[PDB]
Structure formats: structure tokens, C-alpha cells
Amino acid sequence: PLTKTDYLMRLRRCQTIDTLERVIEKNKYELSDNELAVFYSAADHRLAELTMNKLYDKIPSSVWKFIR
Amino acid sequence: LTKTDYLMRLRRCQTIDTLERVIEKNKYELSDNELAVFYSAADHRLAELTMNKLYDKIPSSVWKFIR
Amino acid sequence: EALKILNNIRTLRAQARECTLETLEEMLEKLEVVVNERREEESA
Amino acid sequence: EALKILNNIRTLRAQARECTLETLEEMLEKLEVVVNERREEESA
DSSP: OOHHHHHHHTTTTOTTTTTHHHHHHHHHHHSSSSHHHHHHHHHHHHHHHHHHHOOOSSTTGGGGGGGH | OOHHHHHHHHHTOOHHHHHHHHHHHHTTSSSSHHHHHHHHHHHHHHHHHTTTTOSSOOOOOOGGGGG | OOSSSGGOHHHHHHHHHTTTTTHHHHHHHHHHHHHHHHHIIIII | GGGTTTOOHHHHHHHTTTTTTHHHHHHHHHHOOOOOOOOHHHHH
């Protein structure tokens, strides 16, 4: 099955969140639902490393607090 | 209804097998939205029945022993 | 709301079988972050 | 199952507000136990 890193590859390109909110919105409808669980990890990851302008391989526990 | 309320009722239950039975009967009859809170009391009772001690709040240690 | 359904240790295991371990750690880390936010808020 | 909500930080906070803290603690300690169990399972 598709893994989180794969989704993250594509989402790494998604910039300024507004585009991300759009891409996540575009995904949710048509998404596998079960796979969506893996995709959500990439959404949060990317959103995390975008809110902070740093690129993490693994998101630190410290970072999650800053998400809106 | 609150969890303690369900826990009061389930507190009467003995020998786990009887609890499994009441829990089994509840699954198909309950409000679903309400059922979730019953599950909280159900775990509590089963825990405190698994160990033969009555905890007001369940210690993290016991959850491993649950079947 | 519908988060409350997860407070069932048997059902937690069930739904857990179909998730891989590396995701489980993320969910857990998501969660503790959330309750730590309330431990400070509510309790403190 | 309904776990997909758990790995989504935004709504996770939200739906957590509508639950009490004393349950959140229960759920978390429940979750932590479950994930610890697969660590041994997979292993090596």
C-alpha cells in the first residue's frame, strides 16, 4: 500500500498552505478513506514543516503545539 | 448518563463472564452515542474485576493485563 | 464527540491491527500533545 | 476504523475539547499500552 513518505513527496511541493488547504480538500473527496489516514500524516507533517519554514525528516513533539 | 452511573451498575457484576454477558447484551441495545460512555465504565469494571481490586481511578499498569 | 468512541481498550486493539506501527506512534504523539495541552489548561 | 481522526492534529484538539480531561487521560494511557504491545509484536 501507499506509505506516508510517498504522499509527503508530492505535498512537499505544496506551498503557502492556501494551496495545501486546497490540495487536502481536493484529496479528501476521492480519497481512499483508509489510506487517507496515511495521507493525513503527510498533511500534518507538511503543515508542520511549513508553519515553521524548516524541513523535518521526523517531526519533533515540540512543534505540534504551534499548529492552529 | 455518566460513567460512574454505569460503573455503579456494573459494579454489581461478578466473575467477568457475567460482565461479558451484560456487556454483550448492551452492545446491541444501547444508544451508540450513549454506548461509548458505557464502554468507559465497562473497561473500568473489567479491569477492577481482572485484578480483584476496586479502583476509583484505574492505574496505567493494569491495562496490559486486560484480555 | 466521535473521538470518545476510542476510549475502548478492546476496540482500540481492533482498529489498531490494520494500522502500521509507525503511524501508531504519530497518533500517540499527536494525542499526548493534546492532553498535555489540557493538563496545563484545565488542571493547571 | 475511526482512527483516521486521531492522526489529524487540528480536529483532534477540537473533538478533545468536547471530551473531559479525566477520560482523555484514560484514552491516552489506553493508547500508550496498545502501541507498546505492537513494539514487541513486530520487533527485531
